Amino acid sequence: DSSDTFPKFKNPNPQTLSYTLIAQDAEIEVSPGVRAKVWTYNGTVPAPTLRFSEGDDVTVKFVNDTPYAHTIHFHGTHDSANDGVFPMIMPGEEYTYHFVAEEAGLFMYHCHAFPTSEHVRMGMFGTMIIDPAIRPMDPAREYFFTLSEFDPNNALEHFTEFYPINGYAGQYMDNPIRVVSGELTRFYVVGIGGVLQSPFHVHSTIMKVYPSGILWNEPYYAQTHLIGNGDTAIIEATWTQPGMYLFHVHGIQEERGSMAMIEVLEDASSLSDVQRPSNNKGSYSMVEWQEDLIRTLEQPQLISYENLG
Amino acid sequence: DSSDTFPKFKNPNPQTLSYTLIAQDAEIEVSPGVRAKVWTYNGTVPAPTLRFSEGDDVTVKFVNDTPYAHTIHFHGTHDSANDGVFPMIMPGEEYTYHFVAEEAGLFMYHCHAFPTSEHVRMGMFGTMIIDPAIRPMDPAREYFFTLSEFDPNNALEHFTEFYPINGYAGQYMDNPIRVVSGELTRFYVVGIGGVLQSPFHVHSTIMKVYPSGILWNEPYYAQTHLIGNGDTAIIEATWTQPGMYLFHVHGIQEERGSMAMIEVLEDASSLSDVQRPSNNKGSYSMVEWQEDLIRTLEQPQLISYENLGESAAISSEKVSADKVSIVKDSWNPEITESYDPIAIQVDSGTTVTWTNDDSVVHTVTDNENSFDSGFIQAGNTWSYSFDNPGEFDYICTLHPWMKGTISVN
Amino acid sequence: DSSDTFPKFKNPNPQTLSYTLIAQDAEIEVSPGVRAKVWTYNGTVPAPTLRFSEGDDVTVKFVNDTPYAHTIHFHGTHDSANDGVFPMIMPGEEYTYHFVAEEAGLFMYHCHAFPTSEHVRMGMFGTMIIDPAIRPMDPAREYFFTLSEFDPNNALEHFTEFYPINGYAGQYMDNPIRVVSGELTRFYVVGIGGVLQSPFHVHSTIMKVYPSGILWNEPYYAQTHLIGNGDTAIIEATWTQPGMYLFHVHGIQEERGSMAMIEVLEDASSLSDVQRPSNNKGSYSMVEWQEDLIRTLEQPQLISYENLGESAAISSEKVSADKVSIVKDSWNPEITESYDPIAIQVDSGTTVTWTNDDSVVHTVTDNENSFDSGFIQAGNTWSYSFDNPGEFDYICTLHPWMKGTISVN
Ligand SMILES: [Cu+2]
Ligand SMILES: [Cu+2]
Ligand SMILES: [Cu+2]
Ligand SMILES: [Cu+2]
Ligand SMILES: [Cu+2]
Ligand SMILES: [Cu+2]
Ligand SMILES: [Cu+2]
Ligand SMILES: [Cu+2]
Ligand SMILES: [Cu+2]
Ligand SMILES: [Cu+2]
Ligand SMILES: [Cu+2]
Ligand SMILES: [Cu+2]
Ligand SMILES: [Cu+2]
Ligand SMILES: [Cu+2]
């Protein structure tokens, strides 16, 4: 019960929610002037951020529109039929993953077909935010970020050409992450590389971090937080002085597209039409702005197949 | 509470302090018989350890005495003007960083010029200890340790020839870290590589660790503690049996300079002339001994440059074009023409388009300072409409050798 | 009230244990169709899991039956004589480690000969479970897992062909780890690679983790827990739905042997004859099942040696010089001239200087104990004035095949 933990809590008002994710091969821009073949859910890398509340009855209809077998493996608690290792979902097929959201927190989903590292390297990963039932997280402006490894010439290169934040290298340099002076900000960060780990660092302020994205834990304070591959972190920070700052993975990643600008604004008024009310009651989601920008920059061109069997 | 945490506290007796740090090129010994070129603050790698108290008012005079652009980026809380990204400090120029120490803990500082891995790999990093104001840390013998990656032959090698502790590979094997039986010992450890992480391990005892060097946290007990690059850790331990022991990063680093010997003495008597009273009241700092040894072993040979900031005039013949390439490998000074065409002519009203054909960010910045691209990402373009006749000399603010001209008719 | 921890506690009924570990060379299968040369304790990789209680009196008789120098370094609290650095144990010699188990937790033991990375890559590592004396951990089905790096063609390769769990790559894909629906399960996980770190991930449930394997700590909840090399983690989990699941290191490791099937059973009845009553009272240990399977799959062919006595350096010629090189790559026994010149002649009163021209630490040590350099770091020198006529056979205590002679007249 420490004032900063969120214990497991049976949702008094659960909802039944549904998503449809389609495995789709595509050509996307991953960096200025660099087009690459990817394997995706719904045409972008990262895949759509899924978001619901602890206790909700979640259904994800997965459709395989590629010539290869695929699955979706969600992090979190569920049974074997919903764990995305068996069965393989064959071309043309549909499989309904179904589970009650058992734990709040920050999770990920990604393909688990052999070889899993290759499928993740090709783009088949996304974010799953499960908001707590006992009470909302503190009112905040919310962004999500995946930290990944991408090489357009050799998908399994040990040291990849790019280490993008949200798939497109360097996008938040030309389109800064906007925060408001004195306003709480919350970052949902997903570590989904395969070789190096990710020391996540934010300039000019101290992070409040929930280890592993699990809200049962007492948070701790960090200048840098190491996020292992396959792990997440929910991070809160406040910037009090307007101006431009940075955040990035701390290492060679930041020379290869793991770099973002933070613009601290004195007032929120330019964000009124961009933000959406959050599933955390009282918070402001910028996730939709982020996903619009990802699609705008990646300019996906699907590879549409005819057989599928 | 804790009883082991140090909450944020208003210092009733803050002091005002100042430092001068000079970006200086040098040749240093980094291993026995291995002399290498480095980029430093004040002539050693690591740079000087800065130490003061939470709530102190700190001013750092930064002077750039090299032909590269440089900054100082301090970890911890401060504002944008003092964050070491904006502006780049040009050769021969100076900058004043100023901040009130907002929180206690262990931090670091390092150059944030681009590419940042190159500047850190060449040596521009140091340690920043900020002592808690609510009460002093428990009385202890205190040492600091940077964990870095260094290669004398290729600065940016993924796997470096050396993984030194405090800059000089293996120095604490011949010069052990001395501790006293039964006396609390505190290590201030900074992780500042770019590729591998650092499992910090000490032999024969269990570590008490403040995660991320932040004293607000409850500490935890560890046999090994993973320090990410750009992270720190405050570590306390006691040895109770005299003899020799080791500590090291656990991995291939330990064969490449990341190993140190610990000498547990029966009492503190042989240390009374080498230790110094710590800024943590009641503690015993060995940092001065360490930094004296770093300088003795490195034997730095400072490099001094004449006419910093001066460069020849562009005399290339003007080309009628509205498209300019920022040339591949421009982040290497050996590329003598960094824009192509280096000198262009356009009519009034013409939009010119720069394409960054390098793999490093660059800018296009008027020094009469009528236009400024900001960061241009690798592969991206930046465009500007020139509606006023005259000649405009422009530079990259990240790489001072990089210059061009545009004549508008 | 922090009732999730196990405080340090003076065991009122300590037991006295004596173990015997023998350094033995072997060939083992490390993956289907792949045989490789390894260095072991007692013939398998990993070495035998040692398990006892906090406060127990532990003796480990160590016998080196190989032509390399070896030690056992134990993680946890002990004194210098039992730290496994000093002394090296020479071929055919023996050493008795002895310590009282000073704290509970999950530890590790491995060779600390030099270069340590090579001895750990070659297979000289094991697990050490020290159960708490204050109270047993919660009743659970118990497994242990080492996470290592192994390459059968180049032991020191940065990126290895395999990342096995418990030595044999992929063994738990065909031999699932069996757990029981609703029954607490406890994994004792040891990280013992040298290059990459290990994010340890279990499917379909959230783990409770004791960081660093230290039971004094409050545990925390994780979907993935990063285990640094040289670190451990005690992990607890409960699956509630029967069927097949997975765990693995999250990374490229998972396609190279670091993957395991989990079979959740409806009840424990089918495990009644393989499980054993655990040293944690009330728990069920599966460790014996695991180590039987490791040996069955590895099929070790051991190499015994009976005559490992030192003998003297073999040379065709003697040089009248007072400078000797410790040759590059002499830590590889294939390099047959380890010192150059191997055999030297000097007059009484001559000071001989050795230079370490290798990249690894070496020593110069008389077979009697007239003189000894200790560690000579790469690129450093060590000298000794021979004032009395005589004949001297010296070696490197780190690398027993390195031998030379000094004739003083
Ligand atoms: Cu797939
Ligand atoms: Cu920073
Ligand atoms: Cu995963
Ligand atoms: Cu930065
Ligand atoms: Cu610099
Ligand atoms: Cu150790
Ligand atoms: Cu930094
Ligand atoms: Cu060691
Ligand atoms: Cu530039
Ligand atoms: Cu060995
Ligand atoms: Cu998973
Ligand atoms: Cu170790
Ligand atoms: Cu998995
Ligand atoms: Cu040797």
PDB file of C-alpha atoms in Angstrom, chain C residues 84-231:
ATOM      1  CA  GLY C  84      40.564 -18.324  -4.748  1.00  0.00           C
ATOM      2  CA  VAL C  85      43.082 -15.814  -6.108  1.00  0.00           C
ATOM      3  CA  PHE C  86      46.105 -16.495  -3.893  1.00  0.00           C
ATOM      4  CA  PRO C  87      47.449 -19.139  -4.365  1.00  0.00           C
ATOM      5  CA  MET C  88      47.073 -20.593  -7.821  1.00  0.00           C
ATOM      6  CA  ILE C  89      46.720 -24.378  -7.543  1.00  0.00           C
ATOM      7  CA  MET C  90      49.374 -25.973  -9.748  1.00  0.00           C
ATOM      8  CA  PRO C  91      48.959 -29.162 -11.809  1.00  0.00           C
ATOM      9  CA  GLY C  92      48.562 -32.209  -9.592  1.00  0.00           C
ATOM     10  CA  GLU C  93      48.350 -30.164  -6.385  1.00  0.00           C
ATOM     11  CA  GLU C  94      45.489 -29.701  -3.963  1.00  0.00           C
ATOM     12  CA  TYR C  95      44.032 -27.017  -1.744  1.00  0.00           C
ATOM     13  CA  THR C  96      41.506 -27.126   1.045  1.00  0.00           C
ATOM     14  CA  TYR C  97      39.046 -24.256   1.045  1.00  0.00           C
ATOM     15  CA  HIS C  98      37.236 -23.838   4.335  1.00  0.00           C
ATOM     16  CA  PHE C  99      34.658 -21.311   5.426  1.00  0.00           C
ATOM     17  CA  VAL C 100      31.589 -20.885   7.553  1.00  0.00           C
ATOM     18  CA  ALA C 101      28.618 -19.951   5.365  1.00  0.00           C
ATOM     19  CA  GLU C 102      28.394 -16.318   6.422  1.00  0.00           C
ATOM     20  CA  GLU C 103      25.075 -15.380   4.778  1.00  0.00           C
ATOM     21  CA  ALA C 104      22.199 -17.093   3.001  1.00  0.00           C
ATOM     22  CA  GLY C 105      21.487 -16.532  -0.661  1.00  0.00           C
ATOM     23  CA  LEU C 106      22.196 -17.742  -4.173  1.00  0.00           C
ATOM     24  CA  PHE C 107      25.856 -17.639  -5.126  1.00  0.00           C
ATOM     25  CA  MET C 108      28.243 -19.019  -7.718  1.00  0.00           C
ATOM     26  CA  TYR C 109      31.708 -20.495  -7.836  1.00  0.00           C
ATOM     27  CA  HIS C 110      34.159 -20.484 -10.675  1.00  0.00           C
ATOM     28  CA  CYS C 111      37.812 -20.667 -11.530  1.00  0.00           C
ATOM     29  CA  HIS C 112      39.784 -17.469 -11.063  1.00  0.00           C
ATOM     30  CA  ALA C 113      42.954 -18.452 -12.958  1.00  0.00           C
ATOM     31  CA  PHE C 114      44.104 -15.967 -15.612  1.00  0.00           C
ATOM     32  CA  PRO C 115      42.713 -15.048 -18.076  1.00  0.00           C
ATOM     33  CA  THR C 116      39.528 -15.757 -16.116  1.00  0.00           C
ATOM     34  CA  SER C 117      37.245 -15.305 -19.144  1.00  0.00           C
ATOM     35  CA  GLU C 118      38.922 -18.283 -20.814  1.00  0.00           C
ATOM     36  CA  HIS C 119      38.539 -20.574 -17.773  1.00  0.00           C
ATOM     37  CA  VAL C 120      34.866 -19.609 -17.403  1.00  0.00           C
ATOM     38  CA  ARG C 121      34.208 -19.988 -21.153  1.00  0.00           C
ATOM     39  CA  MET C 122      35.860 -23.452 -20.999  1.00  0.00           C
ATOM     40  CA  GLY C 123      33.281 -24.486 -18.377  1.00  0.00           C
ATOM     41  CA  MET C 124      34.719 -23.985 -14.862  1.00  0.00           C
ATOM     42  CA  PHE C 125      31.636 -22.633 -13.084  1.00  0.00           C
ATOM     43  CA  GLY C 126      28.962 -23.897 -10.716  1.00  0.00           C
ATOM     44  CA  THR C 127      26.055 -22.887  -8.484  1.00  0.00           C
ATOM     45  CA  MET C 128      26.065 -22.507  -4.684  1.00  0.00           C
ATOM     46  CA  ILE C 129      22.694 -22.376  -2.894  1.00  0.00           C
ATOM     47  CA  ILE C 130      22.900 -21.248   0.736  1.00  0.00           C
ATOM     48  CA  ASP C 131      19.559 -21.735   2.393  1.00  0.00           C
ATOM     49  CA  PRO C 132      18.372 -19.274   5.079  1.00  0.00           C
ATOM     50  CA  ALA C 133      18.621 -20.362   8.715  1.00  0.00           C
ATOM     51  CA  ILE C 134      16.029 -17.879  10.116  1.00  0.00           C
ATOM     52  CA  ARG C 135      13.233 -19.847   8.398  1.00  0.00           C
ATOM     53  CA  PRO C 136      12.902 -21.868   5.176  1.00  0.00           C
ATOM     54  CA  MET C 137      11.802 -20.128   2.019  1.00  0.00           C
ATOM     55  CA  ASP C 138       8.156 -20.743   1.163  1.00  0.00           C
ATOM     56  CA  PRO C 139       7.503 -24.374   0.142  1.00  0.00           C
ATOM     57  CA  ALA C 140       8.138 -24.654  -3.594  1.00  0.00           C
ATOM     58  CA  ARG C 141       9.400 -26.887  -6.368  1.00  0.00           C
ATOM     59  CA  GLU C 142      13.032 -25.862  -6.888  1.00  0.00           C
ATOM     60  CA  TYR C 143      15.206 -25.718 -10.036  1.00  0.00           C
ATOM     61  CA  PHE C 144      18.603 -24.158 -10.819  1.00  0.00           C
ATOM     62  CA  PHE C 145      19.786 -22.631 -14.123  1.00  0.00           C
ATOM     63  CA  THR C 146      23.179 -21.315 -15.227  1.00  0.00           C
ATOM     64  CA  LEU C 147      23.177 -18.863 -18.148  1.00  0.00           C
ATOM     65  CA  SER C 148      26.484 -19.113 -19.974  1.00  0.00           C
ATOM     66  CA  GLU C 149      28.214 -18.432 -23.295  1.00  0.00           C
ATOM     67  CA  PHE C 150      29.847 -21.296 -25.191  1.00  0.00           C
ATOM     68  CA  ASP C 151      31.570 -21.601 -28.577  1.00  0.00           C
ATOM     69  CA  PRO C 152      33.050 -25.005 -29.531  1.00  0.00           C
ATOM     70  CA  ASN C 153      35.451 -23.587 -32.143  1.00  0.00           C
ATOM     71  CA  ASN C 154      36.839 -20.383 -30.595  1.00  0.00           C
ATOM     72  CA  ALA C 155      36.403 -20.262 -26.819  1.00  0.00           C
ATOM     73  CA  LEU C 156      36.970 -16.480 -26.645  1.00  0.00           C
ATOM     74  CA  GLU C 157      34.678 -15.426 -29.509  1.00  0.00           C
ATOM     75  CA  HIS C 158      32.724 -12.268 -28.593  1.00  0.00           C
ATOM     76  CA  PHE C 159      29.448 -13.663 -29.928  1.00  0.00           C
ATOM     77  CA  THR C 160      29.334 -17.387 -29.139  1.00  0.00           C
ATOM     78  CA  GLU C 161      27.582 -20.091 -31.136  1.00  0.00           C
ATOM     79  CA  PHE C 162      25.605 -21.136 -28.036  1.00  0.00           C
ATOM     80  CA  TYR C 163      24.113 -19.583 -24.912  1.00  0.00           C
ATOM     81  CA  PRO C 164      23.154 -22.731 -22.984  1.00  0.00           C
ATOM     82  CA  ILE C 165      20.968 -23.013 -19.938  1.00  0.00           C
ATOM     83  CA  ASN C 166      22.836 -25.498 -17.707  1.00  0.00           C
ATOM     84  CA  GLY C 167      25.616 -26.180 -20.179  1.00  0.00           C
ATOM     85  CA  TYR C 168      23.829 -28.224 -22.859  1.00  0.00           C
ATOM     86  CA  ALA C 169      22.049 -26.000 -25.378  1.00  0.00           C
ATOM     87  CA  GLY C 170      18.290 -26.493 -25.676  1.00  0.00           C
ATOM     88  CA  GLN C 171      18.081 -29.479 -23.313  1.00  0.00           C
ATOM     89  CA  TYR C 172      14.782 -28.253 -21.791  1.00  0.00           C
ATOM     90  CA  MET C 173      13.013 -28.077 -25.157  1.00  0.00           C
ATOM     91  CA  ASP C 174      12.930 -31.903 -25.318  1.00  0.00           C
ATOM     92  CA  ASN C 175      12.964 -32.318 -21.516  1.00  0.00           C
ATOM     93  CA  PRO C 176      10.475 -29.685 -20.266  1.00  0.00           C
ATOM     94  CA  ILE C 177      10.802 -28.116 -16.844  1.00  0.00           C
ATOM     95  CA  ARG C 178       7.781 -29.557 -15.022  1.00  0.00           C
ATOM     96  CA  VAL C 179       5.766 -27.423 -12.597  1.00  0.00           C
ATOM     97  CA  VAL C 180       2.437 -28.023 -10.864  1.00  0.00           C
ATOM     98  CA  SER C 181      -0.691 -25.895 -11.282  1.00  0.00           C
ATOM     99  CA  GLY C 182      -1.062 -23.663  -8.230  1.00  0.00           C
ATOM    100  CA  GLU C 183       2.215 -24.807  -6.635  1.00  0.00           C
ATOM    101  CA  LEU C 184       4.910 -22.245  -5.892  1.00  0.00           C
ATOM    102  CA  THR C 185       7.993 -22.716  -8.086  1.00  0.00           C
ATOM    103  CA  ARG C 186      11.457 -21.335  -7.314  1.00  0.00           C
ATOM    104  CA  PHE C 187      14.258 -20.845  -9.862  1.00  0.00           C
ATOM    105  CA  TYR C 188      17.854 -20.320  -8.741  1.00  0.00           C
ATOM    106  CA  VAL C 189      19.361 -18.462 -11.732  1.00  0.00           C
ATOM    107  CA  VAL C 190      23.102 -17.750 -12.191  1.00  0.00           C
ATOM    108  CA  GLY C 191      24.415 -15.304 -14.805  1.00  0.00           C
ATOM    109  CA  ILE C 192      27.896 -16.362 -15.845  1.00  0.00           C
ATOM    110  CA  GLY C 193      28.649 -15.094 -19.325  1.00  0.00           C
ATOM    111  CA  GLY C 194      31.282 -12.507 -20.136  1.00  0.00           C
ATOM    112  CA  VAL C 195      30.001 -10.263 -22.912  1.00  0.00           C
ATOM    113  CA  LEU C 196      26.212  -9.791 -23.109  1.00  0.00           C
ATOM    114  CA  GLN C 197      23.831  -9.462 -20.138  1.00  0.00           C
ATOM    115  CA  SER C 198      20.839 -11.771 -19.608  1.00  0.00           C
ATOM    116  CA  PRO C 199      17.233 -10.462 -19.439  1.00  0.00           C
ATOM    117  CA  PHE C 200      15.583 -13.513 -17.906  1.00  0.00           C
ATOM    118  CA  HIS C 201      11.944 -13.867 -18.957  1.00  0.00           C
ATOM    119  CA  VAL C 202       9.242 -16.375 -18.064  1.00  0.00           C
ATOM    120  CA  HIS C 203       5.995 -16.651 -20.037  1.00  0.00           C
ATOM    121  CA  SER C 204       2.456 -16.101 -18.773  1.00  0.00           C
ATOM    122  CA  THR C 205       3.148 -15.073 -15.191  1.00  0.00           C
ATOM    123  CA  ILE C 206       4.813 -12.326 -13.153  1.00  0.00           C
ATOM    124  CA  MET C 207       7.903 -13.224 -11.170  1.00  0.00           C
ATOM    125  CA  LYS C 208       8.851 -12.361  -7.631  1.00  0.00           C
ATOM    126  CA  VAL C 209      12.590 -11.674  -7.648  1.00  0.00           C
ATOM    127  CA  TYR C 210      15.191 -11.365  -4.900  1.00  0.00           C
ATOM    128  CA  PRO C 211      17.799  -9.046  -6.485  1.00  0.00           C
ATOM    129  CA  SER C 212      21.369 -10.343  -6.597  1.00  0.00           C
ATOM    130  CA  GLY C 213      20.141 -13.553  -4.926  1.00  0.00           C
ATOM    131  CA  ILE C 214      20.393 -11.885  -1.505  1.00  0.00           C
ATOM    132  CA  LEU C 215      17.560 -12.797   0.822  1.00  0.00           C
ATOM    133  CA  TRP C 216      18.106  -9.745   3.055  1.00  0.00           C
ATOM    134  CA  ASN C 217      16.455  -7.734   0.253  1.00  0.00           C
ATOM    135  CA  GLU C 218      12.810  -7.001  -0.207  1.00  0.00           C
ATOM    136  CA  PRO C 219      11.852  -8.771  -3.445  1.00  0.00           C
ATOM    137  CA  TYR C 220      10.158  -7.028  -6.340  1.00  0.00           C
ATOM    138  CA  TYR C 221       7.838  -8.051  -9.187  1.00  0.00           C
ATOM    139  CA  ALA C 222       9.021  -8.325 -12.760  1.00  0.00           C
ATOM    140  CA  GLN C 223       8.008  -9.592 -16.180  1.00  0.00           C
ATOM    141  CA  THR C 224      11.711  -9.709 -17.113  1.00  0.00           C
ATOM    142  CA  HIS C 225      14.667  -9.419 -14.760  1.00  0.00           C
ATOM    143  CA  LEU C 226      18.113  -8.386 -16.011  1.00  0.00           C
ATOM    144  CA  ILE C 227      20.845 -10.624 -14.581  1.00  0.00           C
ATOM    145  CA  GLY C 228      24.310  -9.197 -14.939  1.00  0.00           C
ATOM    146  CA  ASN C 229      27.239 -11.474 -15.495  1.00  0.00           C
ATOM    147  CA  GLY C 230      28.584 -12.552 -12.118  1.00  0.00           C
ATOM    148  CA  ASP C 231      25.140 -11.952 -10.583  1.00  0.00           C
TER     149      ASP C 231
END
